[PDB]
Symmetry: C3
Subunit: 240 residues, 3 copies
């Protein structure tokens, strides 16, 4: 149908094309990659999935665990939950964590926002993602659902990708991609013995703006997220 034709793009595509080209010219984007052992989260998720759907009415995916860890890291690393004004040379450190979530829709990519995500529990996050994705796909968003974001999470693993260099959109200073969670052979070291284990591993590429965040700051922020996910103390957070 499309093949061999020239057609005017829809408004979402036109806006995305304009915003992404401009975004790269008014920021200094680079992507740092860390690997995280998601096995404990995967086991916790598998064990509690039936009780979660029964009590909260929504499916329990990996995304609310990534959101909870990222939002707590943005509170303890306020330098990342920030915006730079290149005209006045002032940095604004936001008190709210307004978390943008990339949502794939048939008309194009949309980035709705979970406002004040720092006040939400894992069940509330799971419900907000479902509500935003549904309203994004059915033209039921309001303008304020698409603005005010202070950081973004993009699920690049939804379509099989291990990694990407996602584009951040100023005034945001960071966008985290959640790669595909894949079983991999990894090395475990305990009591001086190196051995090979099968673990659920994920790559987390973080695109950050070098105007706001330096490489070591990005590493410290990603280390906080990694340690939270690897310990996986989320049982109480599930409110079952």
């Amino acid at each position: 149908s499309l093949r061999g034709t020239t057609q005017k793009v829809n408004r979402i595509r036109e806006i995305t094309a304009m915003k992404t080209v401009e975004a790269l010219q008014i920021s200094a984007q680079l992507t740092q990659l860390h690997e995280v052992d998601m096995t404990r989260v995967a086991e916790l998720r598998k064990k509690n999935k039936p009780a979660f759907i029964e009590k909260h009415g929504v499916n329990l995916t990996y995304l609310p665990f990534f959101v909870k860890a990222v939002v707590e890291a943005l509170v303890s690393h306020p330098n990342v939950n920030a915006s730079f004004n290149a005209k006045t040379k002032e940095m604004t450190y936001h008190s709210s964590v307004n978390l943008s979530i990339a949502v794939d829709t048939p008309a194009g990519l949309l980035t709705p926002v979970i406002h004040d995500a720092q006040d939400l529990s894992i069940p509330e996050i799971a419900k907000a993602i479902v509500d935003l994705a549904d309203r994004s796909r059915n033209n039921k968003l309001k303008p304020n659902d698409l603005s005010g974001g202070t950081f973004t999470i993009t699920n690049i693993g939804s379509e099989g990708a291990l990694s990407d260099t996602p584009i951040l959109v100023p005034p945001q200073a960071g966008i985290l991609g959640t790669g595909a969670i894949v079983k991999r052979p990894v090395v475990i070291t305990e009591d001086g013995i190196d051995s090979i284990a099968i673990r659920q591993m994920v790559f987390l590429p973080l695109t950050y703006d070098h105007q706001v965040v330096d490489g070591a700051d990005a590493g410290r922020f990603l280390t906080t997220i990694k340690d939270r996910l690897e310990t996986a103390n989320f049982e109480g957070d599930l409110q079952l």
Copy 2:
């Protein structure tokens, strides 16, 4: 010889320097990475290499398999074999797949084009790559051999790289890198049993223009390529 000197660059270098700096400013480039199990292609290639050289006169490398899978994916994903006009907001979906191939030459990188690649078999692709690389290296190209490309494949694995973030050149919307194919330990899951196998693995970084392709579209396009290569039903395609 070069060390401690200042010299005027040759024309290929001057053009590359100008085109690549400009390309990044008029597009929104990002690179998505997937991993593909090339074992079946490697076994098929090893088994049929002698019969291929004897019948078709050229060596059988991995590149014609990547080209065949990519060209079929560009036909089934017309949204990727496309160009965006930022002035009129129109997308042109090309009917031809004119596949650019990056060729390393002593005077610099050249990107000759296989026009109407969708009409070619694996032997015809193998011969066209050899012809274009030879004419690129011996100053025997014509101007139309270097224009009209709708997508590019760059063999970054030729010099050992696992991955890269290759630069696309508008009006193209995508450029795929074929990383070095390396034996790696990977996890196989069958009948509920996780186990470790040695497989020939490759990383395929795709740089795409966010004006034309969103992240989920890139993932769906790369999934089509991955499934074609992993199944490796190419015996009949070899025309032996």
Copy 3:
């Protein structure tokens, strides 16, 4: 403390913000990734660490090994230790290797320079890194300690990162990141037998300017570094 405030940034942050945004607009940056087996260097380092601190007064980290291999590669690949003037179309191939080292400080990232690094031994490199990092952190640098660099090495593995797409700053044409050195299961092939070994592996992302270096040139340069590190003939270089 920062949360909920707007504050004027310090001078280092203001300069970094300005330089990194501009750098991307006057160059064609891309990042090629190779993997290197650091096991032999790790064993050599562990065995000689006590004798190194006793004789040279400084701790022996992995960074002087990366610096030695990179500096020798910049001498044998003069096309990488070079600067492009886009106005005159002239390439300057530097005779000195002035190696910039990224240093994380509490006030922000600084990039001091080891001038004429090609004339230094591993102990001299180890001492120069310690001196530059100390003076960077205690406001004891002079202006010429921060200029004249021909290439940069950035230790992204200091804060846990496997990889990054570091930003180069013109007139430099390349910046190498040293990822976190991690034990991984890898495939060894000897006498026709494929087997799985535990090795200390590192990813080395190289951001290069496409105005100066093409992808195959970057691969050849990284292959020289990889072969030097994997052979690890550095015993005599330690001067113990």
